[PDB]
Design a protein around this ligand. Structure first.
Ligand SMILES: C[C@]12CC[C@H](OS(=O)(=O)O)CC1=CC[C@@H]1[C@@H]2CC[C@]2(C)C(=O)CC[C@@H]12
Length: 1188
C-alpha cells in the first residue's frame, strides 16, 4: 500500500501524503510496519531481471567477437532511455539558473537609477521582483524533482546490481568458491555497490557543466566582454587539475582499502582469539602488527584526506579566484566596477562554480570509484560457474599430480545405509559432492533417482526463527514436526526456550550452541523427508552420546526406509549400516544512543590535539569566513564608492586590499580545510590507540559481556566513519553553517527591520525542525536496522551454498533477498521522501526570505544604495539549497557522533593488573615450578557466584597432575585462576613468590598452555612458531620434525615462509594441534598446562602426541584437563572438582580403589571395560612407581 499511487500531481510533487506518518511519528515512535510499500517499478525482482537480460546480450555479442565483454555497456544499454529524459530537468533548471541572474540585474538596476517620483518604474520593478520570486520557486521545484529522481535512479541501479551479484553468487563453481571467500563477496554489497547511489547524481553535469560554461561565457561576453576569458582560463585549468586530483584520490583510496581490509581481518582474529593471545602473552606481537598496519593505513588516509581537502578548498575558493582574475583583468583594461555588472557576473560564476567545479569533478570521482566497483563486479560475474557410480575419477585442479577421486564404482538402493569411511581427506565429502552432482565426473558416470538431501558436515543456520530455519519453506505440520523434533533430539531445548521454536536467531546462530545449531541443521533435512540422504557426518557436530542418539533415532528410526550415504568415523555404529566404502588418497581401498551532549564534542576534539591547537582551529575558521564575506562586501563597497564619483579610484589601494582579502581567503580556506582533517584524523588515531590498548588490557569478562561483532563494529564502522566520512561531513557542515550565518548577518546588517519577519520565520523553522527531527531519527534507526539483515542473508547463504543449491532453493532465496532488499527499499524510500518533504519546506521558508528581502528592499528603497541591495540579494539567492543542505548535514553530523560516543566509552574500560610489577622475579625464576593453592576462592566477577571455593593444593616440581570434574564443575576456572584471568581471592604461591606479587607477564610467559582448539594467525609459519624472531632456524626445523610437519612445509613452496590462511585450512586439525605443540616445544618452560588436548583426536594420532608429551616434557610439572581419562591415567595425582570444591586429590590407584571416589564414578560412567582398563593401568603404573 502506498498513497503516492492515489496522490494528485501536487501531492506527488510536495509529498503531502507523508503528513499522517508525521502526525503519528510526532505522537509515537515509528516502527517497521508504519512504512508504506514501494511501487512496482522499484520491486527488486522486476528491476534486476532487466539488467541481467542486457548483460546476457552483451556477453553474447562479445562472445561472437573475441573481445572480453563490458559491464558498463550492459548498464548503459539498459538504463539510458529512462535516465536521459531526466536531463530535461537539468536543461530547464540550468537555463533558468542563467536567466535568473539577469532578472537580479534588472532589480539592482532600479536602485542604480532610483528616481524620486517615477510611478511606472516602481511598478515594473515589482513585476521583476515577482518574476524573480517565481523563478526561485520554479528552480527549487525542478531542483527537488531532479535530485529526487536521480536518487531513485541510483537506488534502482544498486538494487538491480545487488540482485545480479546475489544471482551470480548462487551458481559459482567450487573452484570459484575457492579463490573467492565470503568476506570479499560481502564487501561487494557493503562497500562497492553502495557506489552506484552516488554515480547517477551528477552524470547529467558531464555535459551540462561544459555547455552551461559555454552559455555563461557568451552571456558574460555581453556583460563585460573579453575579460570573461581570464575566468574561463582559470576554469579550464581547474578542470584537468581537479579531475587529476579526483582520479589520484580514487587511486589512493583503492590502495588504502587493502591495508584497511588487512587491519580489519587481523583485528577480527585478535578479538576472536583474545584469550589465547593473553595466555600466550603474544600481545606484544599483535600490538606491533596492528601498530604497523594502522601506521601505514593512517599515512594513506592522511594523504588521501589532504587531497580531498584540497579539492574542497578549491571549490570553496573557486569563484573567489575566478572573480578576482576576471575583475582584475577587467579593471586593468580600463573598466569600472558597478553593482549591476559585478553581482550579475558573481551570480553567473556562482552557477558555473556549482556545476563545473563541484558537480563535474564529483562526477569524475564517482565514475572512477564506480569503475573500480564495476571491475570487481565483472571479475565476480565472469568467474567460473537407486544410486550408481561407475569408473568415477575427477580433479579439483588439473595441476594436481593425481586425480582427487579415482577408480570409484558403487551402488546403493532403497532400504540401505551406505557408510563412507576412511582417513581425513580421503575424498568422502568430495564423493558426496560428486553423488550430488556438484563434482562432475572427468570419467565414469553417476545416476540417481528421486530427491536428494545433502547435510553438510558443518551446520548452517540463517535468519528468522529456528523453526523457520528447520521448515525451510515447508508447511508447518504438528505430526511430522513432532516426529522431526523428537527424532533430532531437540524437543527439550525448544521447550526450555521461552519463545520456544519462535526464538529469533542471529547472523550465525550466535545465540545457539554448536550442538543446538547442529541439531537445527539436521532437523531441517529430516523435515524434507527426501529419498536419498547424503549425510556428510552430521554427528561430529554433537557430543558422543548425542551422536549415537541421533544415529539411532534420526538415521535408523526416522530415515529407516531411505537410501542413506553416511560419511562418518563411528564404525561402531555401522553394524547397522548396509554397506561401507573405504577411500584413501581419493581412491577406493575397500568396498563392502540517539542523543549526545557537549562533553562528547569536547572529548572528541580534545583527543585530537592540545586545546591551543583547537583555539587556533576555531580562529582559522572564523577568519576564513570573515575574509570570504569581506571580499564580497569589498566588491559591494567598491561599487558604492565608484557610484559616488574627472577622477577615479586608486586601483592600488582597492585592488591591493582586494588581493590581500582574496589571498587570505585562499590561505585560510586551505589551512582551514587541511587542519580540520589533521585534528580529526589525529583524534581518530589517538582514540584508536586508546581503545586498542584498553581492549588489549581489558579483562576477559569484558569479552564475555559483549559479542564479537559488537566490538568489531567499533573498529570497522565507527572508526571507519571517524577516518573517512565524519571529518568530511564536519568540514561540510562547518563550511555551510558559516555561509548561512554570513547570509543572515549581511541581510540583518543591510536592513535591520528584516529581524522582525525573521522572528516568526525563525520560530517556524525551529518548530518545523523539531517536528521533523522527531521522525527523522526514527527513520535513520529504521534504515540501519533494515540494512543489516541483507548482508546477513548474503553471508549466511554463502556459508550454506551447498545446501540451498542441493534443495534447488535458489528461487526462494532470491525472493528472500528481494524481500529484505525491498523492505530496506521502503526505509530508503522514506529516507528519500521524508528528507525531500523537509528540504522542500526549508526551501519554502528560505524563499519567503528571498521574497521579504526583494520586496522589503523596494518598500524601503529610499534608504538603500544599489551595492547594499545587490550584496544582500545575491547572498539571499545563494541561500536556496545551502540552508537546507546545512540543516540536513547538521543532522548527519549528530547522527555520526553516536559512533564517536560508542568508541570513547571503550577508552575508559577497567584494566587488568599491570603486566610487570616494580618487583620482578629472578631470570632463573621459576627455578623449580612449585605451585601452591591455599584457601583460594575465585569468581569470574565480584557480582557472580564463587565458582571456586577454598581451593587448596600443592603441586611440586616433578609430579604430573590431572584436572578432572563434571561439566561446569570449575575445571576451566582453575586455568582462569592460575593465569589470573580473573583476580582470585586468597594465596597462590609459585616458587615462594605470591603470583599476586608479580606482574601478569612474569608468570604468564613462564607457563605453557595448549588450548582446547588450535588457532593459526595470518602470516608466515615462522610467525606462528616464533613471533618475536629470537630462535635459530635450526631449532624451528627440529621442532617441525618433532611435530611431524617438516615434510609438508618443505613440500610447500616457501618452506616456513609459505603464507597461511586465516583459518589454517591449508592444514588439518591434527596439523593445527601440531603447530600448537611446536609452539610449546620452542618455549622451554617448567610447567605445561594441557587443556583437553586429545579428547577428540583419533587414537592413531593421540598416541603420537602422548608419546611426544612423554618425551619432550618429561622434566615438567604437567596439569592436564581431560575428558579422555586415558590421557591422564598415568598421572602421579588427580584433582577432582565436585562443584568449585577440591574434594579429591590423591594417587589415581589409591582413589580408584576407593570405589566411592568421584573419580571412580566418572570412570564407571564410561563403562565396565573402560574402567577395568583404566584401573589396571593405574594399578600397574602405581606398582612400578613404588618399585624404583
Ligand atoms: C550545492 C550544495 C549547497 C551549497 C554549498 O555551498 S557551500 O558554500 O555552502 O559549501 C555546496 C553544496 C554542496 C553539496 C550539494 C549542495 C546542495 C544539495 C546537493 C546538490 C545534494 O543534494 C547533494 C550534494 C549537495
Amino acid at each position: 500500500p502506498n498513497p503516492l499511487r492515489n496522490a494528485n500531481l501536487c501531492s506527488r510533487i510536495f509529498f503531502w501524503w507523508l503528513n499522517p506518518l508525521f502526525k503519528i511519528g510526532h505522537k509515537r515512535r515509528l516502527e517497521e510496519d508504519d512504512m508504506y510499500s514501494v511501487l512496482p517499478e522499484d520491486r527488486s525482482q522486476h528491476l534486476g531481471e532487466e539488467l541481467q537480460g542486457y548483460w546476457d546480450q552483451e556477453v553474447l555479442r562479445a562472445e561472437k567477437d573475441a573481445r572480453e565483454p563490458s559491464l558498463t555497456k550492459a548498464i548503459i544499454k539498459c538504463y539510458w532511455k529512462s535516465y536521459v529524459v531526466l536531463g530535461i530537468f537539468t536543461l530547464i533548471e540550468e537555463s533558468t539558473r542563467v536567466v535568473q541572474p539577469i532578472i537580479l540585474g534588472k532589480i539592482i538596476g532600479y536602485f542604480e537609477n532610483y528616481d524620486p517620483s517615477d510611478s511606472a518604474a516602481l511598478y515594473e520593478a515589482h513585476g521583476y521582483a515577482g518574476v524573480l520570486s517565481a523563478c526561485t520557486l520554479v528552480l527549487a521545484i525542478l531542483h527537488h524533482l531532479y535530485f529526487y529522481h536521480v536518487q531513485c535512479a541510483g537506488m534502482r541501479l544498486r538494487v538491480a546490481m545487488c540482485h545480479m551479484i546475489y544471482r551470480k553468487a548462487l551458481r559459482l563453481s567450487n573452484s570459484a568458491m575457492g579463490k573467492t571467500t565470503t568476506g570479499q563477496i560481502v564487501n561487494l554489497l557493503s562497500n562497492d555497490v553502495n557506489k552506484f547511489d552516488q554515480v547517477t547524481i551528477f552524470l547529467h553535469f558531464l555535459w551540462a557543466g561544459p555547455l552551461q560554461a559555454i552559455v555563461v561565457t557568451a552571456l558574460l561576453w555581453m556583460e563585460i566582454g573579453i575579460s570573461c576569458l581570464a575566468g574561463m582560463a582559470v576554469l579550464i585549468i581547474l578542470l584537468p587539475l581537479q579531475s587529476c586530483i579526483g582520479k589520484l584520490f580514487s587511486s589512493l583510496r583503492s590502495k588504502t582499502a587493502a591495508f584497511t581490509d588487512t587491519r580489519i581481518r587481523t583485528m577480527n582474529e585478535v578479538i576472536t582469539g583474545i584469550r589465547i593471545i593473553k595466555m600466550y602473552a603474544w600481545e606484544k606481537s599483535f600490538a606491533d602488527l596492528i601498530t604497523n598496519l594502522r601506521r601505514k593505513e593512517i599515512s594513506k588516509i592522511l594523504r588521501s584526506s589532504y587531497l580531498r581537502g584540497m579539492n574542497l578548498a578549491s571549490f570553496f575558493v573557486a569563484s573567489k579566484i575566478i572573480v578576482f582574475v576576471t575583475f582584475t583583468t577587467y579593471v586593468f583594461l580600463g573598466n569600472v566596477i558597478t553593482a549591476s555588472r559585478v553581482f550579475v557576473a558573481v551570480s553567473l560564476y556562482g552557477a558555473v562554480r556549482l556545476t563545473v567545479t563541484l558537480f563535474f569533478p564529483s562526477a569524475v570521482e564517482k565514475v572512477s570509484e564506480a569503475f573500480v566497483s564495476i571491475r570487481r563486479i565483472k571479475n565476480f560475474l565472469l568467474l567460473d560457474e537407486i544410486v550408481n557410480v561407475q569408473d568415477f575419477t575427477a580433479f579439483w585442479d588439473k595441476a594436481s599430480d593425481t586425480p582427487t577421486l579415482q577408480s570409484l564404482s558403487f551402488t546403493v538402493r532403497p532400504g540401505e545405509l551406505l557408510a563412507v569411511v576412511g582417513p581425513v581427506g580421503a575424498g568422502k565429502s568430495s564423493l558426496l559432492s560428486a553423488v550430488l552432482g556438484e563434482l562432475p565426473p572427468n570419467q565414469g558416470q553417476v545416476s540417481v533417482h528421486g530427491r536428494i538431501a545433502y547435510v553438510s558436515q558443518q551446520p548452517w543456520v540463517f535468519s528468522g526463527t529456528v523453526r523457520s530455519n528447520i521448515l525451510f519453506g515447508k508447511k508447518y505440520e504438528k505430526e511430522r514436526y513432532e516426529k522431526v523434533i523428537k527424532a533430532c533430539a531437540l524437543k527439550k531445548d525448544l521447550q526450555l526456550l521461552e519463545d520456544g521454536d519462535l526464538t529469533m536467531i542471529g547472523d550465525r546462530g550466535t545465540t545457539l550452541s554448536g550442538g543446538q545449531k547442529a541439531r537445527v541443521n539436521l532437523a531441517r533435512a529430516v523435515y524434507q523427508d527426501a529419498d536419498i540422504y547424503l549425510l556428510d557426518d552430521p554427528l561430529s557436530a554433537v557430543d558422543a552420546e548425542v551422536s549415537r542418539h541421533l544415529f539411532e533415532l534420526c538415521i535408523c528410526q526416522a530415515l529407516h526406509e531411505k537410501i542413506r550415504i553416511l560419511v562418518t568415523h563411528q564404525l561402531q555404529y555401522l553394524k547397522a549400516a548396509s554397506q561401507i566404502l573405504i577411500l584413501k588418497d581419493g581412491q577406493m581401498v575397500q568396498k563392502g544512543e540517539g542523543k549526545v551532549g557537549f562533553k562528547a564534542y569536547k572529548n572528541y576534539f580534545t583527543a585530537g590535539a592540545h586545546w591551543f591547537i583547537i583555539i587556533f582551529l576555531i580562529l582559522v575558521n572564523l577568519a576564513a569566513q570573515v575574509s570570504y564575506i569581506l571580499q564580497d562586501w569589498w566588491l559591494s563597497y567598491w561599487a558604492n564608492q565608484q557610484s559616488a564619483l574627472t577622477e577615479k579610484l586608486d586601483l592600488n589601494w582597492y585592488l591591493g586590499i582586494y588581493s590581500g582579502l582574496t589571498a587570505s581567503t585562499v590561505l585560510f580556506g586551505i589551512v582551514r580545510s587541511l587542519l580540520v582533517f589533521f585534528v580529526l584524523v589525529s583524534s581518530s588515531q589517538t582514540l584508536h590507540n586508546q581503545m586498542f590498548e584498553s581492549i588489549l588490557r581489558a579483562p576477559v569478562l569484558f569479552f564475555d559481556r559483549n559479542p564479537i561483532g559488537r566490538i568489531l563494529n567499533r573498529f570497522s564502522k565507527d572508526i571507519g566513519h571517524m577516518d573517512d566520512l565524519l571529518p568530511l561531513t564536519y568540514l561540510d557542515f562547518i563550511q555551510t553553517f558559516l555561509q548561512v550565518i554570513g547570509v543572515v548577518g549581511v541581510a540583518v546588517a543591510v536592513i535591520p527591520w528584516i529581524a522582525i519577519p525573521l522572528v516568526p520565520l525563525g520560530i517556524v523553522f525551529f518548530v518545523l525542525r523539531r517536528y521533523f527531527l522527531e521522525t527523522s531519527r526514527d527513520v535513520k534507526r529504521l534504515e540501519s536496522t533494515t540494512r543489516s539483515p541483507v548482508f546477513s542473508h548474503l553471508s549466511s547463504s554463502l556459508q550454506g551454498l551447498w545446501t540451498i543449491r542441493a534443495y534447488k532453493a535458489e528461487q526462494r532465496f532470491q525472493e528472500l533477498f528481494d524481500s529484505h532488499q525491498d523492505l530496506h527499499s521502503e526505509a530508503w524510500f522514506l529516507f528519500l521522501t521524508t528528507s525531500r518533504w523537509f528540504a522542500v519546506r526549508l526551501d519554502a521558508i528560505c524563499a519567503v526570505f528571498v521574497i521579504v528581502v526583494a520586496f522589503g528592499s523596494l518598500i524601503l528603497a529610499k534608504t538603500l544604495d544599489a551595492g547594499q541591495v545587490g550584496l544582500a540579494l545575491s547572498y539571499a539567492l545563494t541561500l536556496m539549497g545551502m540552508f537546507q543542505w546545512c540543516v540536513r548535514q547538521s543532522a548527519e553530523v549528530e547522527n555520526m557522533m553516536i559512533s564517536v560516543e560508542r568508541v570513547i566509552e571503550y577508552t575508559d574500560l577497567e584494566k587488568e593488573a599491570p603486566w610487570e610489577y616494580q618487583k620482578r622475579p629472578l631470570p632463573s625464576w621459576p627455578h623449580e615450578g612449585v605451585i601452591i593453592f591455599d584457601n583460594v576462592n575465585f569468581s569470574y566477577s565480584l557480582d557472580g557466584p564463587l565458582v571456586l571455593k577454598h581451593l587448596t593444593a600443592l603441586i611440586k616440581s616433578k609430579e604430573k597432575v590431572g584436572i578432572v570434574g563434571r561439566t561446569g564443575a570449575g575445571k576451566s576456572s582453575l586455568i582462569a585462576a592460575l593465569f589470573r584471568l580473573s583476580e582470585p581471592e586468597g594465596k597462590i604461591w609459585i616458587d615462594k613468590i605470591l603470583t599476586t606479587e608479580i606482574g601478569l607477564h612474569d608468570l604468564r610467559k613462564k607457563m605453557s598452555i595448549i588450548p582446547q582448539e588450535p588457532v593459526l594467525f595470518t602470516g608466515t609459519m615462522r610467525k606462528n612458531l616464533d613471533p618475536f624472531n629470537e630462535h635459530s632456524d635450526e631449532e624451528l626445523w627440529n621442532a617441525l620434525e618433532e611435530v611431524q610437519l617438516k615434510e609438508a612445509i618443505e613440500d610447500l613452496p616457501g618452506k616456513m615462509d609459505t603464507e597461511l590462511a586465516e583459518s589454517g585450512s591449508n592444514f588439518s586439525v591434527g596439523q593445527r594441534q601440531l603447530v600448537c605443540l611446536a609452539r610449546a616445544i620452542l618455549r622451554k618452560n617448567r610447567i605445561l598446562i594441557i587443556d583437553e588436548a586429545t579428547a577428540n583426536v583419533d587414537p592413531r594420532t593421540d598416541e603420537l602426541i602422548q608419546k611426544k608429551i612423554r618425551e619432550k616434557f618429561a622434566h615438567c610439572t604437567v596439569l592436564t584437563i581431560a575428558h579422555r581419562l586415558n590421557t591422564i591415567i598415568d598421572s602421579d595425582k588427580i584433582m577432582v572438582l565436585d562443584s568449585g570444591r577440591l574434594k579429591e586429590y590423591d594417587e589415581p590407584y589409591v582413589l580408584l580403589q576407593n570405589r566411592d571416589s568421584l573419580f571412580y564414578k566418572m570412570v564407571q560412567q564410561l563403562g565396565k571395560a573402560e574402567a577395568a582398563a583404566l584401573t589396571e593401568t593405574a594399578k600397574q603404573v602405581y606398582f612400578k612407581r613404588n618399585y624404583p
